[PDB]
Chain A
Amino acid sequence: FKGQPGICGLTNLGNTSFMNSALQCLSNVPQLTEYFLNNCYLEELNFRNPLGMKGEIAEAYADLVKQAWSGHHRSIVPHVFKNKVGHFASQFLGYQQHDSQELLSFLLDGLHEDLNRVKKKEYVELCDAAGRPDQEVAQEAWQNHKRRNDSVIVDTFHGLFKSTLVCPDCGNVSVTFDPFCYLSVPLPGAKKILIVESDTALSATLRSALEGRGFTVDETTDGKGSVEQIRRDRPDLVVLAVDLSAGQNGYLICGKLKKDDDLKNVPIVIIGNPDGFAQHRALSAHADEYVAKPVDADQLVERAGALIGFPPVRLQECIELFTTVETLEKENPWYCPSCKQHQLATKKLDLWMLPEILIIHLKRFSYTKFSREKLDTLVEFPIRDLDFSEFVIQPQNESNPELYKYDLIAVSNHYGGMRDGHYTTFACNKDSGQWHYFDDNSVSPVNENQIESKAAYVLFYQRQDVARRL
């Protein structure tokens, strides 16, 4: 039939929805697809690169791109691509379910080496940043990366992080720059609140009030087990009652949490008779907030939002958390070479340079002693006008507006658990601006307000200057 170019499904070859999803994201990266449709890749095939596969990844991907954008096919069977992918990365041999960002990482790397313009990779020790301006240090680090990696992949997807360490003792500052291809951002939380309260009627009232603003709420009247339940369920906030059954004391439980080095950072809202607040602030480690009993439910909800922020989790807050100033904990001190000793230094990641196409990877997973599970909380992300000027505009940096703003072009969606699931893709067609939902063979048009869902796992963003350059 005569289909629309790029509007083409991909048959599942046996647990390969993760591959199809990654492929649909990439097919709708405009400069990559044009690079392959114009045969620009033929002149940059690197057959002697030991880290490549004799161009086979680039040629098989090119064939997929050409077939999908021909308008000749409703759907395509990418079996050759799968066989070449597995030959390059043996884990993908067979019929296993896989992570779609992992497949993308290997695919992008395969394309990069197969088209690497460097003949041989040289290791060059970076020089001390001490006393040199940030831009000069950043340039040396990018040029060290480019001396080894110079391809359309680097030109399209790679940016630069600044990482800064500050010694709390002597003030020594240590600057480093790392290239990146995936901006893997942590989640601030799941907007889950645990209520530790032996008054079950009161607890249910507060649960409804909180759920009325979108919080997930768990409840427990068992004070003895509360510390360990907090360690297991990892709530974003604890509403902790002072007077508990079986002679438990919320103030004492708070003390236990503030003494534990894992649990000391969990926000704690104490609800109790007000006449107990002065003493706890005078004698003990402060709860993060005190709310007087009979509880004004609106006041408690207001305080919860002020501490952890109202639902839902915003992509902006993931990026802000990623770039936050963090203090190294006692297990991870930095050896300051100026004062020649281990220090609980502060570390901050900054977005120094951002690529034409930005891949944002949400860390939708958690690992504790007790369980590993997927974080499935809704993360709101913008379809248009994602503005990084508040993160990139830092001392020794500037730009023009379109350089720091992005529009979404694709989303890889995951459904299921960590080890059993399914992948689909939202993607915006470069020729028409219409979004579609790709589920293996099934391709359907969608509006922009349908893209966002808790299934979103990998976001592809296109810098607003990119559309214009042609």
Chain B
Amino acid sequence: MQIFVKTLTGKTITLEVEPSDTIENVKAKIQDKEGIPPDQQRLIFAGKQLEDGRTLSDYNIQKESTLHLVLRLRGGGGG
């Protein structure tokens, strides 16, 4: 099936996946198109951040669904 990822600029890309594809695989495909390392990618769908080890069906990601890609602004303040 096909799914979509809305990226940092808003540009949506298209992914060819299977419902049993792992998040690691999905991230690899995202990297293939956008070049962001998988460890820096955060993928959000339905108020879940997608975690390596689980599958697209685990998160109820069905065909033509759109994932949302974000990075991290880390902060701790020291303290």
Residues of A within 8 A of B (CB): 11-12, 14-18, 21, 95-102, 105-106, 108-109, 112, 123, 125-126, 144-145, 148-149, 153-154, 157-158, 161, 163, 165, 174, 176, 178-182, 184, 186-187, 321-322, 324, 326, 328-329, 331-335, 347, 349, 361, 363-367, 369, 372, 374, 414-416, 418-423, 440, 457
Contact = CB atoms under 8 A, between A and B. Distances in A.
* Interface range, B side: 35 or more
Nearest to A21: B75
B12 A326 contact: yes
A172 B66 CA distance: 19
Nearest to A318: B10
24 contacts: A15-B77, A16-B79, A17-B76, A18-B75, A18-B76, A105-B47, A105-B49, A123-B60, A144-B60, A153-B47, A181-B47, A184-B68, A321-B10, A326-B12, A347-B12, A361-B70, A363-B70, A365-B70, A365-B71, A367-B34, A367-B35, A367-B71, A420-B75, A422-B75
Interface in B35-79: 35-36, 40, 42, 44-49, 57, 60, 62-66, 68, 70-79
A227 B9 CA distance: 20
B77 A99 contact: no
Given A12-B79, A186-B6, 14 more contacts: A97-B75, A123-B57, A148-B60, A178-B45, A180-B68, A182-B44, A184-B68, A335-B2, A349-B6, A419-B74, A420-B75, A421-B73, A421-B74, A423-B76
A97 B74 contact: yes
A421 B10 contact: no
B41 to A, nearest CB: 10
A149 B47 CA distance: 10
A15 B76 contact: yes
A421 B78 CA distance: 9
A366 B8 contact: yes
Contacts of B76: 12, 14-18, 95-98, 421-423
Nearest to A95: B76
B70 A101 contact: yes
Contacts of B74: 18, 96-99, 418-421
A331 B75 contact: no
Given A12-B79, A144-B60, A334-B14, A457 B73 contact: yes
Contacts of A158: 46-47
A332 B13 CA distance: 5
Contacts of B68: 180, 182, 184
Nearest to A322: B10
A105 B24 CA distance: 19
Nearest to A366: B8
Contacts of B63: 176
Contacts of A17: 75-77, 79
Contacts of B72: 98-99, 102, 365, 418-419
Closest 4 CB pairs between A and B?
Answer: A15-B76, A181-B47, A12-B79, A97-B76
A97 B76 CA distance: 4
Contacts of B64: 163, 165, 174, 176
Contacts of A180: 46-47, 68
A15 B79 contact: yes
B66 A163 contact: yes
B49 A414 contact: no
B71 A14 contact: no
Contacts of B46: 145, 149, 158, 178-181
